[PDB]
Amino acid sequence: QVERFTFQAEINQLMSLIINTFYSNKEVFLRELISNASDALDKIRYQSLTDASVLESKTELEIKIIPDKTAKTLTLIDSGIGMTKTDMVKNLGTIARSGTKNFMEQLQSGAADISMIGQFGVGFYSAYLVADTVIVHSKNNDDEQYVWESSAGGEFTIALDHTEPLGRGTKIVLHMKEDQLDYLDETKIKNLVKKHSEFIQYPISLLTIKEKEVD
């Protein structure tokens, strides 16, 4: 079963602005997504300080990053608190803070910059600086694994996830744009992850997939 939702008006503007207009430091997306991953890890960790049984679904607190040149995807997986179905609609389809709604006017006027999008809990959408389509798989202890998809257009979808179980956490899949495929190159992404994760307290693994014909 697939359930359709409309983005809240501001989110469409934020997304239109991100997609339609232009920015020069697209690499901030990685910083934002790694920061979200760390936040989620912080959340489950803080829960485990009062109740260590929350960690049972997946004991490792870590981030995994997988560039796939063949699939043209960059995937980021964290074992954070994950999102329930309601959490997904809220966190990926709405703006909560009224302060964030004002910031959208300072951003749209050009006074504010894309790189500060994270200070208002919307750094996620910076993924559309490099990806035409973004898939989010998420699993929270108090609910089932759901999968969230959007390619903008004023709408997103959510379904029960039947792909590989996460145990607990969030998997974001960016279907890269053709012009932004070098983010899947080993040296590029390694240095960018190193740069944008210096203060992150969690381990971060970078996967490299090499393919050679036998001869």
Curated annotation (Swiss-Prot):
Membrane-spanning segments: none
Compartments where found: Cytoplasm
Domain of life assignment: Eukaryota
UniProt note: domains: The TPR repeat-binding motif mediates interaction with TPR repeat-containing proteins.
Function: Molecular chaperone that promotes the maturation, structural maintenance and proper regulation of specific target proteins involved for instance in cell cycle control and signal transduction. Undergoes a functional cycle that is linked to its ATPase activity. This cycle probably induces conformational changes in the client proteins, thereby causing their activation. Interacts dynamically with various co-chaperones that modulate its substrate recognition, ATPase cycle and chaperone function.
Protein family membership: Belongs to the heat shock protein 90 family.
Entry protein name: Heat shock cognate 90 kDa protein
Lineage of the species this protein comes from: Eukaryota, Amoebozoa, Evosea, Eumycetozoa, Dictyostelia
Gene (name only): hspD
Full protein stretch here: 5 to 219 of 700
